[PDB]
Design a protein around this ligand. Structure first.
Ligand SMILES: CCC1=C(C)/C(=C/C2=NC(=C\c3[nH]c(/C=C4/NC(=O)[C@H](C)[C@H]4CC)c(C)c3CCC(=O)O)/C(CCC(=O)O)=C2C)NC1=O
Ligand SMILES: CCC1=C(C)/C(=C/C2=NC(=C\c3[nH]c(/C=C4/NC(=O)[C@H](C)[C@H]4CC)c(C)c3CCC(=O)O)/C(CCC(=O)O)=C2C)NC1=O
Ligand SMILES: CCC1=C(C)/C(=C/C2=NC(=C\c3[nH]c(/C=C4\NC(=O)[C@H](C)[C@H]4CC)c(C)c3CCC(=O)O)/C(CCC(=O)O)=C2C)NC1=O
Ligand SMILES: CCC1=C(C)/C(=C/C2=NC(=C\c3[nH]c(/C=C4\NC(=O)[C@H](C)[C@H]4CC)c(C)c3CCC(=O)O)/C(CCC(=O)O)=C2C)NC1=O
Ligand SMILES: CCC1=C(C)/C(=C/C2=NC(=C\c3[nH]c(/C=C4\NC(=O)[C@H](C)[C@H]4CC)c(C)c3CCC(=O)O)/C(CCC(=O)O)=C2C)NC1=O
Ligand SMILES: CCC1=C(C)/C(=C/C2=NC(=C\c3[nH]c(/C=C4\NC(=O)[C@H](C)[C@H]4CC)c(C)c3CCC(=O)O)/C(CCC(=O)O)=C2C)NC1=O
Ligand SMILES: CCC1=C(C)/C(=C/C2=NC(=C\c3[nH]c(/C=C4\NC(=O)[C@H](C)[C@H]4CC)c(C)c3CCC(=O)O)/C(CCC(=O)O)=C2C)NC1=O
Ligand SMILES: CCC1=C(C)/C(=C/C2=NC(=C\c3[nH]c(/C=C4\NC(=O)[C@H](C)[C@H]4CC)c(C)c3CCC(=O)O)/C(CCC(=O)O)=C2C)NC1=O
Ligand SMILES: CCC1=C(C)/C(=C/C2=NC(=C\c3[nH]c(/C=C4\NC(=O)[C@H](C)[C@H]4CC)c(C)c3CCC(=O)O)/C(CCC(=O)O)=C2C)NC1=O
Ligand SMILES: CCC1=C(C)/C(=C/C2=NC(=C\c3[nH]c(/C=C4\NC(=O)[C@H](C)[C@H]4CC)c(C)c3CCC(=O)O)/C(CCC(=O)O)=C2C)NC1=O
Ligand SMILES: CCC1=C(C)/C(=C/C2=NC(=C\c3[nH]c(/C=C4\NC(=O)[C@H](C)[C@H]4CC)c(C)c3CCC(=O)O)/C(CCC(=O)O)=C2C)NC1=O
Ligand SMILES: CCC1=C(C)/C(=C/C2=NC(=C\c3[nH]c(/C=C4\NC(=O)[C@H](C)[C@H]4CC)c(C)c3CCC(=O)O)/C(CCC(=O)O)=C2C)NC1=O
Ligand SMILES: CCC1=C(C)/C(=C/C2=NC(=C\c3[nH]c(/C=C4\NC(=O)[C@H](C)[C@H]4CC)c(C)c3CCC(=O)O)/C(CCC(=O)O)=C2C)NC1=O
Lengths: 172, 162, 9, 50, 69, 162, 172, 172, 162, 172, 163
């Protein structure tokens, strides 16, 4: 639920003292580059159908055990649930990127997803591989600079990749 | 708490849909208004002790009878609690300015204050006078955008008190 | 966990 | 779920309209659930299965 | 709801018809007996489930009036 | 047609209270974002007919099988329908730019799209390619904030189509 | 539930022609006055409680009967409902001022209130007096330029006056 | 909500006697004709997409004013409601046709739809002529004898035409 | 009025999709059932008065203790319109035979059964033994499938009375 | 939904001035007479099912047509509804007796019961005749001073009579 | 959790808090008697699966010529294997729904969530619509008597779902 600003305010309350001028400057710098982050998440959302299409195609090209009967994503309903699963994973990664903090992704997708899939019998490593493929497609799509001013967004690329890293580590 | 980006994330979750240009515009405007709000936070932080002391003595001026023995105001511990409460309020107002919303203030003072009010007989008008003095004091400590936004935050707090 | 056991028999 | 709701959080307009009775208690429950506090307590910190 | 097509709430006057009461008796009195005629205000978006549910319940719509437009 | 103002006031009505820093900030940021979207709407209004014809030929071009006899797209009245439909789409895009929100597009076309499209066997890819032409031409039409507004709204219409 | 730009877009759609550059100019003129209009709305909002208290005190001043037995507000509940109804009416008038339209104010608050007061027997004359006192105190607090840059707000005052007058007419 | 057999049962109840010999013969014959009308309604359900597509195409070809700006079928949602009204109205007509009693058709929304359309402002004559389109398309589709044996259907066609006439009269 | 096609229509109209193969086949089975049931009803109506009167003396025989002065039906009129009531139940059995469903029974007689019996101090066991005599005779009159539906309907009636 | 005390306090507040001693004296006198009326209500409750049984027997005695086919009481569940209506009307009579005010009867049931039985088309004169039946049987059991001290219930008998008469007048 | 006539009956009875009345028994009898033509049709379709799938492949090819050229989605040896596999599974589930005397198998297996699969794989239903069109054309002679229409009902429902 909490973003970087909320998290900083939470620590300030925990110590009970006002926000430090240094941390206020850090938040000012974060807000200054906020336009770049908004551009990054917009690039995420327009390419999100493309990212998921690419990730699904490459995953199904490398793994075939699911398309056959007895696969965890064999029936149309099951694999459709799989597709929306990756969709929602990417959506929550984007939400964390907006927030700059992983608290919201933890609250939504990383509190109890593991045992949920264990009960469903879902293999988590397949989900982690799908996360990796979406991460690759997303870094490809955001490292492009179509119709937007060029600039150093390596920090945003690193942050998004690391958010995918926490998501993958959570699931598997 | 309830920051603009937080509530945007929550509502985007609600309809089960990604973000769009409108909410990103809201976040944009939040980012630009942060800088005058950041300067407001600096001005309020550097002035916090004088703010608290002036508010306490302004409340005393408005209602000196409270300081009389047998009343809530009388007692050095009582006055220290007055100052500590006003300092907490000022800190949460700084958090409001930083967060670009009422989220932290709402959650951490406005949630369940009137209960304590009624229980401990803590008249809201006292903190209302303190915040009015803080308004008058920041009228000179701040100017332009920062003064206006800090004023609207603190008068939001006042209207919540009353 | 309880919902899981009802999926199969 | 026995979560205590702060007296500031509750909606006055909905309960007033229920008091007049133009809205059924079912409608008031709808308005309660739609209120952001429901999500903040329930939808926001908890997974969707939970 | 918020949409311009979501607005234009319409009021509904509902009569607990004789067929409705006969169906209610067989299903069971799990709701208190009220006078057969009662009014109701329904937004545009949930306008449909109202008369659908009244149709499975057996009742009929007395009339329709519009709060907005 | 939906405006950020409209959603703000609808939420305020649902919560039944007055307007604090966040609602006023959203209203402001939409007012400053109003004029570049207005200019983008004008810049798309000037090239309405050229855009319509270019989209028609782009549809005829990208997918070869839309032109041949016996096809649903083929037809003089059918082509008139194509032009009129593309005009509807881009005019409501201009409406959304005017309102500074996606809501106009959302309700006016996006609501009830897919089931109507398969009601008459309408290919979404056709409208996707028409709006791809719209993107290509509007990219050279506009620069700056107006460019961003127009491109984001047309691409939101595409995402609805997709 | 609409604002003035929604109104113009609705007519543009029903004619199906494009929003004219003259219409764009008029709504842009509204937009650049929007910054000032939001200050007017904030003046209504932040000053609402004191305005309501003063207006109600005056209502009790000119209408002594309403607190006395047989008055429409003589039960405590009834003058309580008076207070909250005036608060909600001023809130909806502020909604109208910020949206710059009459639809937002007239769709919900001003749609079934006249019938409610007619069936219940509330004297609509007293409610009209309350609304006009709301308008008077609103003007008193909107002319207050304290801690805000001075400027001409005549359009805002006229539009808020129209909103108050139309609200009173709908109530009456 | 009474079948044709239930209709006869209620009639015998109100006469307070058993069902007549001739009543038994007619109802047994109706049961014998039940298979034919089951086949007819099965075709109706199967031909429903074709019926609705043809009827809508004909309607829009001979009524373009529904499609012009601000038209009753313009907003792409008003015409969507038109399509759903088409399918649900032919659904009720099929209900009546298989049932053998127009009372269920009359009780299911035929009591409310007239004033519903009066309130919405939709011209009910367009609805009735669209019902005539339903009749034409459905009759044409049911005339097909493919993959089924040949037999009498004239009585069923007459009954369906009477049901369509009743629906049109109830609408307008 | 819950003939099988009636809940077919109800289930179809409850949600949005039309009739599919399952209920079409169910109606096929109903039309198949309708004939032997109709000869069952005809043969049963051929033997109304003898059956009802014989069941009436059977009711007396199985419960002699009631038949004493003090009997609820004691006296010619009471037992006569007892036979009238039995004929009424037979009427509604015939109606259900026609409908091939418990429509008439459930709708008319079973609804409000226990409440009336408590109101009028009537033992259902009288009715039950009457329908037992109905079993006994109908074991001869009706044969084959028609016999089966008749027996099952009377069984349902007994379970309702039980 | 009032009582004697509620109406008395209502008129006392209507005059605005305090309660007057004479009204207090009448209220005290009623309170002294209270236990008689209480026991009367209790006896009515105890005898209620027998009241309904005997009154129904009479209803069949003077009217046989309802039992005959087509009567509004001819179906089993319709006459069951008849019985529970006898129940509820005499229960409301008991309510009026225990309260002593008429509005608790009127507002709570009679207003809607009017349109209810007008729409149902049941002859209300027979309903009031049945009400008279309950009146007779209830007075038979109430006059019974079995197992309780003997006293002057003549005023209570008059009140019960008036309650039955006004209920019959309202329903018929 | 399939929905077949007897299973639907059981679910309805459990929901209502009651046992099985006459109608449930009659419906069970009808399903049991109709199972024989359905089993006949299932075996007959089982005999000639290869001809059906191959003819479906060539029918899809001939109906839309713009596909099997290189550079688009349908071109490819793996694509051909996937075409054969998809048509095989389609006829598998059609036979399953034939045997179940209910569409529940088809619904749950494929019709549940099919649309998002299509839009995530660019698969317009029209190819499989034409495939099933050829399938019913072929089975227009494969079966006889009741089995013909038993197949027809479920395949038509599947096509309507594909629409
Ligand atoms: C908010 C956090 C959260 C999310 C988003 C979430 C998704 C989710 N996936 C589910 C099951 C599922 N999940 C999958 C995904 C699998 N398919 C493939 O084989 C892979 C191994 C893998 C994806 C790469 C499948 C196939 C099911 C259906 C299980 C079944 O029917 O057998 C379910 C429960 C049943 C259902 O919805 O149909 C949920 C809620 N769960 C959560 O707690
Ligand atoms: C539950 C049983 C089941 C079904 C119904 C099924 C259909 C199916 N076919 C798929 C891929 C495919 N299917 C086809 C077949 C196409 N070739 C063209 O000629 C036609 C339009 C069409 C067949 C006539 C092709 C070419 C792909 C590859 C799509 C891609 O990866 O880009 C996929 C996506 C999985 C993947 O990419 O590996 C599914 C779910 N699969 C199943 O396990
Ligand atoms: C509705 C939401 C929204 C968007 C989409 C938006 C685009 C946007 N991006 C901007 C700057 C920028 N945008 C980016 C980000 C992009 N450049 C990098 O190469 C990346 C490929 C990519 C992000 C991953 C950067 C690096 C800048 C330059 C920073 C600056 O101008 O201050 C600007 C300022 C233009 C100016 O100062 O003249 C705008 C308006 N603005 C908005 O309010
Ligand atoms: C959400 C954050 C936000 C707020 C609060 C806001 C109000 C606001 N209005 C301004 C200008 C102004 N504001 C007003 C309105 C006021 N002046 C009149 O005397 C009236 C008494 C009164 C109206 C009730 C006027 C007339 C101007 C100058 C006209 C212009 O905009 O150029 C300014 C610029 C001066 C400054 O730095 O303080 C601000 C900040 N704008 C924002 O972005
Ligand atoms: C059935 C009767 C009942 C019980 C048993 C009960 C216990 C209880 N305590 C709660 C929270 C709490 N309870 C306390 C009180 C304790 N913590 C402090 O340290 C004190 C030492 C001490 C009080 C003297 C506090 C401070 C909280 C706040 C924690 C939170 O909700 O976040 C809550 C959550 C309610 C909500 O906010 O929605 C419950 C249910 N509540 C009840 O209605
Ligand atoms: C204002 C909201 C609105 C929308 C969105 C709209 C699209 C639309 N086009 C239609 C007919 C049609 N539309 C087209 C054109 C399509 N085929 C291709 O050539 C083109 C790429 C593409 C159009 C850009 C054709 C050929 C028809 C003929 C009917 C058919 O066979 O579907 C129809 C069915 C009835 C009609 O309007 O004529 C709709 C709903 N119409 C509207 O009133
Ligand atoms: C039947 C329901 C009912 C009640 C309960 C009632 C009492 C009552 N007296 C009032 C006025 C008042 N009441 C007081 C008395 C208080 N102030 C001090 O002087 C005293 C210590 C204290 C008395 C114990 C005063 C001074 C006012 C005038 C308020 C004003 O200045 O306008 C008000 C508020 C109206 C106003 O603001 O003028 C109420 C509700 N009237 C009713 O119709
Ligand atoms: C749809 C949005 C909405 C509206 C419009 C609204 C106002 C509203 N006013 C009402 C009547 C009322 N209006 C008033 C106020 C009048 N009487 C006196 O106090 C004054 C002279 C005067 C005010 C100046 C009162 C007292 C009632 C209730 C009368 C009673 O209960 O006896 C009622 C019905 C009874 C109740 O108050 O619960 C509503 C719902 N509430 C809403 O949720
Ligand atoms: C129980 C079954 C049922 C029916 C029959 C029904 C009719 C119905 N149609 C409606 C709207 C509508 N219906 C239509 C269709 C009509 N106008 C067109 O010109 C056609 C000629 C014609 C098709 C019959 C249109 C255009 C609207 C939109 C009216 C509006 O936007 O206000 C509405 C208002 C809410 C909505 O559906 O959007 C109802 C209640 N509602 C039901 O629940
Ligand atoms: C579960 C739903 C259902 C199905 C699947 C069904 C198929 C079906 N319908 C039949 C009767 C029939 N079916 C038809 C077909 C009609 N002839 C006309 O040309 C029309 C185009 C066409 C449809 C109205 C005919 C003529 C009969 C024989 C009439 C009779 O003997 O009653 C028969 C028996 C014919 C035989 O075995 O020789 C079957 C198997 N019937 C049903 O009730
Ligand atoms: C709608 C279906 C229906 C039912 C269920 C029915 C039974 C029935 N039994 C009644 C009373 C009675 N019922 C009986 C018969 C019982 N007492 C004897 O001992 C018999 C052995 C025994 C029968 C098994 C008698 C003798 C009365 C007379 C009591 C009275 O008149 O109040 C009454 C009250 C009115 C009347 O019929 O005269 C009904 C309606 N009649 C119906 O039309
Ligand atoms: C909320 C308070 C309340 C009232 C006002 C009330 C009266 C009442 N009687 C009703 C039906 C009925 N009322 C009667 C009784 C009449 N017909 C004949 O038998 C007699 C001559 C006469 C009675 C002496 C009958 C037979 C019905 C059923 C009509 C039917 O089922 O079609 C109904 C319709 C709803 C239902 O049956 O559940 C009401 C509301 N019951 C209540 O619980
Ligand atoms: C469990 C609840 C309860 C009940 C019901 C109850 C009845 C009851 N009613 C009483 C008063 C009485 N009530 C009555 C009335 C009765 N005599 C006739 O008039 C009527 C048949 C009948 C009333 C309709 C009488 C005569 C007295 C005695 C008053 C006296 O002393 O003169 C007394 C006190 C007797 C005395 O002190 O003299 C009792 C115990 N007591 C209870 O604790």
């Amino acid at each position: 639920m909490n973003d970087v600003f909320t998290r900083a305010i939470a620590q300030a309350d925990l110590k009970g003292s006002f926000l430090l001028e240094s941390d206020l400057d850090k938040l000012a710098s974060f807000a200054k580059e906020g336009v770049k982050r908004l551009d990054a998440v917009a690039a995420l959302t327009n390419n999100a159908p493309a990212i998921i299409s690419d990730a699904a195609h490459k995953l199904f090209a490398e793994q075939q055990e699911l398309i056959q009967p007895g696969g965890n994503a064999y029936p149309h309903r099951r694999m459709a649930a799989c597709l929306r699963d990756m969709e929602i994973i990417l959506r929550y990664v984007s939400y964390a990127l907006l927030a700059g903090d992983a608290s919201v992704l933890d609250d939504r997708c990383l509190n109890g997803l593991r045992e949920t899939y264990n009960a469903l019998g879902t293999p988590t490593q397949s989900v982690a591989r799908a996360v990796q493929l979406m991460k690759d497609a997303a870094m490809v799509h955001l490292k492009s600079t179509a119709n937007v001013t060029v600039g150093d967004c390596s920090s945003l690329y690193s942050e998004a990749a690391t958010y995918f890293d926490k998501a993958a580590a959570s699931i598997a | 708490s309830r920051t603009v980006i937080t509530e945007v994330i929550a509502t985007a979750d609600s309809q089960g849909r990604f973000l769009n240009s409108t909410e990103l515009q809201a976040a944009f405007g939040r980012f630009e208004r942060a800088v005058p709000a950041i300067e407001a936070a600096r001005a309020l932080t550097k002035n916090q002790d004088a703010l608290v002391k002036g508010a306490v003595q302004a409340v005393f001026k408005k209602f000196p009878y409270v300081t009389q023995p047998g009343e809530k105001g009388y007692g050095d511990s009582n006055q220290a609690k007055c100052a500590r409460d006003i300092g907490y309020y000022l800190r949460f107002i700084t958090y409001s300015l930083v967060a670009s919303g009422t989220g932290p203030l709402d959650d951490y003072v406005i949630a369940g204050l009137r209960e304590v009010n009624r229980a401990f007989n803590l008249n809201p008008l006292w903190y209302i006078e303190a915040l009015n003095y803080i308004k008058g004091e920041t009228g000179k400590l701040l100017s332009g955008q920062s003064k206006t936004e800090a004023l609207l935050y603190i008068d939001h707090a006042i209207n919540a008190l009353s | 966990d309880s919902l899981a056991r009802s999926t199969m028999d | 779920g026995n979560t205590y709701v702060m007296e500031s959080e509750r909606p006055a307009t909905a309960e007033s309209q229920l008091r007049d009775g133009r809205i059924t208690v079912r409608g008031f429950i709808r308005l309660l659930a739609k209120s952001d506090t429901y999500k903040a307590r329930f939808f926001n910190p908890a997974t969707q299965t939970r | 709801a918020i949409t311009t097509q979501g607005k234009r709430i319409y009021k509904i006057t509902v009569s607990e018809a004789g067929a409705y009461a006969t169906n209610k008796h067989r299903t069971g009195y799990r709701a208190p007996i009220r006078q057969s005629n009662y009014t109701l205000t329904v937004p545009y978006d949930r306008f449909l489930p109202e008369m659908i549910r009244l149709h499975q319940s057996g009742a009929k719509i007395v009339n329709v009036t519009s709060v907005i437009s």
